[PDB]
Structure 1
Amino acid sequence: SQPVLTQSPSVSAAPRQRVTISVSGSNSNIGSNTVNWIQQLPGRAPELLMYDDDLLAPGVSDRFSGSRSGTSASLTISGLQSEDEADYYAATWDDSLNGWVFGGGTKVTVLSAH
């Protein structure tokens, strides 16, 4: 009974680098409905990060940006910081199911030299 939206896989990346997370859906969801991005920090509850495709929730760093076109969307993290290490989830409405649908989550791991 898997998540309906398809996100790109979990990724590791170095501090200060950029990462792009992709999600695809279909006409019934992302095709005609805006996307929210949810961030779940380690040991914390999920929180809203971006909403209505490209808007920053209160308190969210301007290093995040979002986009949507056709049946896909993306979240871009610029100047990656260790505090960005988290699970990221796409969410949207689906008119054929008459309910909210979600991606499976993308973990962003931030590299450390130890």
Structure 2
Amino acid sequence: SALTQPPSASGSPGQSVTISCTGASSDVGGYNYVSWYQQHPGKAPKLMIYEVNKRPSGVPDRFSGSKSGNTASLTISGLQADDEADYYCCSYALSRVVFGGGTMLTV
């Protein structure tokens, strides 16, 4: 299926924001096949959150992820100036990656 993301997000520095992602599919393996990417204007994206109960190395603890049912959530504790970028969620359950419409996060 296709993923749905808000058109844009807004939040003051220091506070927290949440990005919604509805439409993630599943299979006989599990329900945690959700990944997040951050792409700054003028460069390639970067894997920020994958397997939301975990996170890769070199990524600060400010980026957190969760999932309740068919909706995924991206929690950012602290907002900074270098956080303005397009955040996409990806579903890779049925051997097929699908990128959502994306959201514009501005501080």
Normalization by structure 2: what TM-score? 0.85
Give aligned pairs, total: 105
Give the aligned CA root-mean-square deviation in angstroms: 2.0
The one of 88, 93, 109 aligned to 2:106: 109
Q: Deviations over 1:26-46 (max 9, x none)?
A: 5447x8352000011222210
Structure 2, unaligned runs of 5 or more: none
Aligned pairs for 1:24-43 (under 5 A) are 24-28=22-26, 32-43=31-42
Separation in 1, partners of 2:87, 2:47 = 10
Runs of 4+ in 1 over 3 A off after TM superposition: 26-29
Work out whether residues 13 and 109 of structure 1, in 8 Å CA contact, stay in contact via their aligned partners in 2: yes
Work out whether residues 90 and 105 of structure 1, in 8 Å CA contact, stay in contact via their aligned partners in 2: yes
Q: Please state which structure has a larger fraction of its residues in strand.
A: 1
Structure having the higher Rg: 1
Normalization by structure 1: what TM-score? 0.80
Work out whether residues 24 and 91 of structure 2, in 8 Å CA contact, stay in contact via their aligned partners in 1: no
1:18 alignment counterpart: 16
- After TM superposition, give the deviation of residue 53 of structure 1 in Å: 1.8
Structure 1, unaligned runs of 5 or more: none
2:81 alignment counterpart: 82
Say whether residues 1:47 and 2:46 are aligned partners: yes
Change (3 A) 1:33 1:15: closer
Separation in 2, partners of 1:87, 1:27 = 22
